[PDB]
Design an enzyme around this catalytic site. Structure first.
Site, short mmCIF file in Angstrom:
data_model
loop_
_atom_site.label_atom_id
_atom_site.label_comp_id
_atom_site.label_asym_id
_atom_site.label_seq_id
_atom_site.Cartn_x
_atom_site.Cartn_y
_atom_site.Cartn_z
N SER A 33 0.77 -1.24 0.01
CA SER A 33 0.08 0.20 -0.14
C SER A 33 0.85 1.34 -0.14
CB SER A 33 -0.84 0.07 1.03
OG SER A 33 -2.19 -0.75 0.76
N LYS B 1 3.14 6.59 5.02
CA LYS B 1 2.06 5.46 4.68
C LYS B 1 2.65 4.20 4.80
CE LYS B 1 -1.40 3.81 2.39
NZ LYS B 1 -1.24 2.61 3.48
N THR B 2 1.87 3.07 5.27
CA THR B 2 2.55 1.94 5.58
C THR B 2 1.84 0.94 4.25
OG1 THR B 2 0.49 1.40 6.63
CG2 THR B 2 2.37 2.09 7.87
N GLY B 3 2.69 -0.19 4.30
CA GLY B 3 2.10 -1.42 3.55
C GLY B 3 2.26 -2.67 4.07
#
Ligand SMILES: N[C@H](CCC(=O)O)C(=O)O
EC number: 3.5.2.6
Length: 270
Positions: free
Chosen positions: A50, A214-216
């Site tokens: 993501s 922003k993580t993923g």
């Protein structure tokens, strides 16, 4: 679990941290004043998961600069669009949402349905890749929709970036001149408001930094976090990207690794 957790806590440099989790860790710490980068595996490919959503949102904002009122356009949320991870859009099935609100949702909650609807607005993964190329990133690439884009295989470059390419792109897009000022500020604010990264880089960074991130992740071994660090006392921002594959540890331990990246980075800035 204790020995692995203790080894992660004791790691004082990125190479030792990678070894402590038996993983593959890619990190870039970028000083935006000088361009100087420190890190580990900075030019190896990792799955974006993501983390790409930052640049999908940027693509929307860029298109809105030439399409008046795009951000206010309302997009239907249909039952058929809903995926397992749709925390915001699930409340809007059978009605619609603004493009702007879909952007916020996909950044701050990682809502997958929001991302697919935005892909439909902008022209799909090809449009995001074209935006990246035009901005000066020849490395990162968007190829697939959610949830298929989260797959990774060595030698398969679909939906990948490198820590250094993503760090440079965050600088150009979130801090630089790729977007108009109001657009870049809106994107920065979404990153600042992210809700999914409390246990990741943010957990290792001190109060001197205002963080946007922003993580993923995927279900196999990937856990990522990419961040912009603004010094609250003023001065040049820093950019910190962290991509991890560590299948031998748990999802929660992967967050602990990313927090330790933050602690190491904070000490390296000084
Ligand atoms: N793949 C996840 C989103 C889906 C989920 O959390 O279940 C991410 O990268 O943020």
């Amino acid at each position: 679990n204790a020995p692995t957790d203790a080894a992660i806590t004791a790691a004082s440099d990125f190479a030792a941290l990678e070894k402590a989790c038996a993983g593959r860790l890619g990190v870039t710490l970028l000083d935006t004043a000088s361009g100087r980068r420190i890190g580990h595996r900075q030019d190896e490919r990792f799955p974006m998961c993501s983390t790409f959503k930052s640049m999908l949102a940027a693509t929307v904002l860029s298109q809105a600069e030439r399409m008046p009122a795009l951000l206010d356009r309302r997009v239907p949320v249909g039952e058929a669009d809903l995926l397992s991870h749709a925390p915001v859009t699930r409340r809007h099935a059978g009605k619609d949402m603004t493009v702007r609100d879909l952007c916020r949702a996909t950044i701050i909650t990682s809502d997958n349905t929001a991302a697919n609807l935005l892909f439909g607005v902008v022209g799909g993964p090809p449009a995001v890749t074209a935006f990246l190329r035009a901005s000066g990133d020849t490395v990162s690439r968007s190829d697939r929709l959610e949830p298929e884009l989260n797959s990774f295989a060595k030698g398969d470059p679909r939906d990948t970036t490198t820590p250094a390419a993503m760090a440079a792109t965050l600088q150009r897009v979130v801090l630089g001149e790729v977007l108009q000022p109001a657009s870049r500020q809106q994107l920065a604010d979404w990153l600042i408001d992210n809700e999914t990264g409390d246990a990741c880089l943010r957990a290792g960074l001190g109060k001197r930094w205002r963080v946007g991130d922003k993580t993923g992740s995927n279900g196999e071994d990937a856990r990522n976090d990419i961040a912009v660090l603004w010094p609250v006392a003023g001065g040049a921002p820093w950019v910190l990207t962290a991509y991890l594959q560590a299948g031998a540890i748990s999802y929660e331990q992967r967050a602990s690794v990313l927090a330790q990246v933050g602690r190491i980075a904070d000490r390296l800035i000084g």
